[PDB]
């Protein structure tokens, strides 16, 4: 409908796949080469389905900060025959607050879904499903089961992936440029 939705659509149309694990179907953001991200609660194993194709997992790393606290981001390298468009230049370098974000989801359940979530707070610490978690972004939208892995964007920046909610607020794990240096 406007420039926020434009940037979000551009990311969804080229940099997402549908990932299926034993724990469900997730929006999965491809960042560069064969490297993607997914919430750690997806429990990625040795094999994952990518757009309903059986795919070997070459590497999976559940990120933690240097306090050894959960960040809820798993970086996956996929044995796929095709590279993602490199979007690392759209990743923030530092922790920050944002105005006017969009949460975008693409699964069998919720195809072509875009949600204007408004102001995004650098929330920091969250007890996420009983797990102490750092680098959490918060938005005041009643997000639902099926939106985990959703991409959070502003115009020109990919800032996070949706990892949970409490019925009134939604929570995303930050993406930082420093996670994807190679």
UniProtKB/Swiss-Prot annotation:
Q: Which residues form the active site?
A: 41 (for protease 3c activity), 72 (for protease 3c activity), 148 (for protease 3c activity)
Catalytic reactions of this protein: Selective cleavage of Gln-|-Gly bond in the poliovirus polyprotein. In other picornavirus reactions Glu may be substituted for Gln, and Ser or Thr for Gly
- Ranges of residues in domain Peptidase C3: 2-180
Q: Where in the cell is it found?
A: Host cytoplasm
Q: What does this protein do?
A: Major viral protease that mediates proteolytic processing of the polyprotein. Cleaves host EIF5B, contributing to host translation shutoff. Also cleaves host PABPC1, contributing to host translation shutoff. Binds and inhibits host IFIH1/MDA5, thereby inhibiting the type-I IFN production and the establishment of the antiviral state. Cleaves host MAP3K7/TAK1, resulting in inhibition of TRAF6-triggered NF-kappa-B induction. Cleaves host TICAM1; this interaction allows the virus to disrupt host TLR3 signaling. Cleaves host IRF7, resulting in inhibition of type-I IFN production.
Subunit description? Interacts with host IFIH1/MDA5; this interaction inhibits host IFIH1.
What protein name is recorded for this chain? Protease 3C
Gene source species: Human enterovirus D68
């Amino acid at each position: 409908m406007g420039p926020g939705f434009d940037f979000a659509q551009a990311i969804m149309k080229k940099n997402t796949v549908i990932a299926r694990t034993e724990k469900g179907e997730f929006t999965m953001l491809g960042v560069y080469d064969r490297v993607a991200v997914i919430p750690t609660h997806a429990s990625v194993g040795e094999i994952i389905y990518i757009n309903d194709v059986e795919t070997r997992v070459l590497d999976a790393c559940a990120l933690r900060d240097l306090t050894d606290t959960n960040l809820e981001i798993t970086i996956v390298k996929l044995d796929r025959n095709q590279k993602f468009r490199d979007i690392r230049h759209f990743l923030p370098r530092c922790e920050d607050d944002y105005n006017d974000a969009v949460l975008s989801v693409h699964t069998s359940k919720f195809p072509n879904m875009y949600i204007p979530v408004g102001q995004v707070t650098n929330y920091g610490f969250l007890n996420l499903g009983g797990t102490p978690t750092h680098r959490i972004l918060m938005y005041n939208f009643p997000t639902r089961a099926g939106q985990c892995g959703g991409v959070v964007t502003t115009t020109g920046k990919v800032i996070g992936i949706h990892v949970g909610g409490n019925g009134a607020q939604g929570f995303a794990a930050m993406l930082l440029h420093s996670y994807f240096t190679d």
